[PDB]
Ligand binder design. Structure first.
Ligand SMILES: CCCCN(C)C(=O)n1cc(C(=O)N[C@@H](Cc2cc(F)cc(F)c2)[C@H](O)CNCc2cccc(OC)c2)c2cc(C#N)ccc21
Ligand SMILES: CCCCN(C)C(=O)n1cc(C(=O)N[C@@H](Cc2cc(F)cc(F)c2)[C@H](O)CNCc2cccc(OC)c2)c2cc(C#N)ccc21
Lengths: 387, 387
């Protein structure tokens, strides 16, 4: 799948995107890769943050569905007009599909200044598509209309340092392999967790450790009210009780240095002299996931290099600065972009499972790397799912 | 070396011993394996703790050197009479050696009741032999007089739980492979550190971590005034400054549970309800050792299953009880039996180096294992040696 390697650009703070074309003749647009939703939508009218948009009147293959659509996400939202058009992915499979497209005409806190993307590719399942589940998501259309196998995999590559507008445009941000798995993108074994239900990419977390120390919560707390894999969100997002426990434990592990409350609240940066970030004082975080074999689990392990997101200094000094990329969630557990940066993630829709392997592009140091390890004989895993 | 596999009995608290014979006809004696000294010495007169002893008058091959010897160890000591006699190792190489033997006639806090050993085999170099370096140590005699290669290796096997008197007598305590390496005794790769000077088996520690967190001391502190590998001592022993930092850090890492000071002083037991020992709250300890390649180091990682030593619960309960097997040292760093239990240790005298590999009999849990890992780029490491 060499043609699809390195087809992504962007970063965790603003999103990872793929180049797509819509319409006839092709209109090129940059599209956010979002495993956390199921609508394919593009800017279709001028916006202060868009440098280009979808022009339906210029596409001869545009079909009007005569229907409005409203999509509220947790914080941002948009409103649009539904239609269909021919769609291609220049650095994807050699195919053209007719897919539903929501032409965005109004939005609030959706588009991101300087992100270089003009649309969103919702890669999850029909159940969470708006207006309802009859609006067939793009990936479903792709599989139905082509011979592309029913799976995709994602390698999101964090740089480990801040990127300005110029750098981010010229830097490779990762890979989206549509229809397969590319072996150059990972090391070690792929470990698979079942997709609990095909709506979001929902998984079940059975155990959490901070530097090997068990948080020792009822596992239902880890999945309350769901746990999802979401490339459309920056942070590891954790339910209230889990967040508080995790933060207390991370603070205690790293207590040789003190940080303001605002840092732990995800709001303010901390800076260190160039090169002197004390990675070793911060713990690793292991999430144990339900295995495919009964009574088995595996674990994925992330470093502070994942959960501390590089940010530019307010000064823009030689210092190395970061934000705490773990937040309290109103929506259950979310494995956002900063988690996904540690791993090659395989969305095996065909076998209703998600694969994890250590990413060939994850940021680490000489002393520690991200890990995917198993098996473990685990307690009563099904019970960890919330109802 | 199949004949020598499983030729050890014992445990960390009382010593690991090998069967030997001395004199003509052969007198069978159990002998403590001690890499921390250089005198071969045996009980030679009745003692409350000895069920048998060396009877020089009954040996036709006994030679009386007409000279006294006094050996003070840190806490224990003995005096005796020097001589030579023929020595063999029934479950060792098929050879007979004429070796120096100190016939112990008086002792204080040396013999251990119930240990089942009657003598000591000092396997270190002539430099620390008493009365002086002219008294050829046993291993030197063995190599000089036979075709046995100048190398031995040790696998000390801790049970991970208490053994009673009959249990320790009927259990395999490990292997002393004289003249070679047995591949069934380890997993992974052997990593070698240089022997700094041929007296004690002296090594250089270049970095110490507690759960990945750097103790952040000048590396000379870890080797002040020396660091040795010592099977004749139970604990990991650390110079005052290193000990204080380590205990602080281990208390910090295990802080969710509080223990009396006397536990941390290695004096008192801590007990938990049967099977409930909270291994996960205790940190791993990594000792980085100087590599053979310039600017290269490797690390050995021990678990709490190594540094918490199982001791019997003498009360009516079924508790699992332990002592803290890390002590403050007046004599530099000592890698005692509890450390060695984690690893297969190769005393490669011929190449002036010590090999470490994960032991096939180390105690662990399903979440963590002991490790031997490298390489790490490390600088100015000869600077870590004390002068
Ligand atoms: C890599 C993204 C760049 C940075 N941004 C904008 C973000 O970190 N975030 C993206 C979120 C979000 O809500 N993401 C959308 C996509 C999105 C990306 C973006 F770019 C700007 C947006 F409007 C939205 C996912 O799809 C959510 N999945 C669950 C869900 C929640 C609610 C409705 C859903 O289905 C329609 C799905 C989001 C939510 C919270 C909360 N609470 C905090 C930060 C968030
Ligand atoms: C196999 C462990 C059984 C339990 N015991 C008795 C011990 O834990 N220990 C053994 C020690 C000790 O001093 N060991 C001797 C051997 C020994 C074993 C035994 F069985 C009873 C003993 F008399 C002695 C080594 O040889 C020391 N190497 C450096 C050195 C220090 C001073 C002089 C030296 O060369 C002569 C060497 C020792 C020292 C301290 C101190 N400080 C604390 C505990 C110690």
């Amino acid at each position: 799948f060499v043609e699809m390697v390195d087809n992504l650009r962007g970063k965790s703070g603003q999103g990872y995107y793929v180049e797509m074309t819509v319409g006839s003749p092709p209109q090129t647009l940059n599209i956010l890769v979002d495993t956390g939703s199921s609508n394919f939508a593009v800017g279709a009218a001028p916006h202060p943050f868009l440098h280009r948009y979808y022009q339906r009147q210029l596409s001869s293959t545009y079909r009007d569905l005569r229907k409005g659509v409203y999509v509220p996400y947790t914080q941002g939202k948009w409103e649009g007009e539904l239609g269909t058009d021919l769609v291609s992915i220049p650095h994807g499979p050699n195919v053209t599909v007719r897919a539903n497209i929501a032409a965005i005409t109004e939005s609030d806190k959706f588009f991101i200044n300087g992100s270089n993307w003009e649309g969103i590719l919702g890669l999850a399942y029909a159940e969470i598509a708006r207006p309802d589940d009859s609006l067939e998501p793009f990936f479903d259309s792709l599989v139905k209309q082509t011979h592309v196998p029913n799976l995709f995999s994602l390698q999101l590559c964090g740089a480990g340092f801040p990127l300005n507008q110029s750098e981010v445009l010229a830097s490779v941000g990762g890979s989206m392999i549509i229809g397969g798995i590319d072996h150059s993108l990972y090391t070690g074994s792929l470990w698979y967790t079942p997709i609990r239900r095909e709506w979001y990419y929902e998984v079940i977390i059975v155990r959490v450790e901070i530097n090997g120390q068990d948080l020792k919560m009822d596992c239902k707390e880890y999945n309350y009210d769901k746990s999802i894999v979401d490339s459309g969100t920056t942070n590891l997002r954790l339910p209230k009780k889990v967040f508080e426990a995790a933060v207390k434990s991370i603070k205690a592990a790293s207590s040789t240095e003190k940080f303001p409350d605002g840092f732990w609240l995800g709001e303010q940066l901390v800076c260190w002299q160039a090169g002197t970030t004390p990675w070793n004082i911060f713990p690793v975080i292991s999430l144990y996931l339900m295995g495919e074999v009964t009574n088995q689990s595996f674990r994925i392990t992330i470093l502070p290099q994942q959960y501390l997101r590089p940010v530019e200094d307010v000064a823009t000094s030689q210092d190395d600065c970061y934000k705490f990329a773990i937040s309290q969630s109103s929506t259950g557990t979310v494995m956002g972009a900063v988690i996904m940066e540690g791993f090659y993630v395989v969305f095996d829709r065909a076998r209703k499972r998600i694969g994890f392997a250590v990413s060939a592009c994850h940021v680490h140091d000489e002393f520690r790397t991200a890990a995917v390890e198993g098996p473990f004989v685990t307690l009563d895993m099904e019970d960890c799912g919330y109802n």
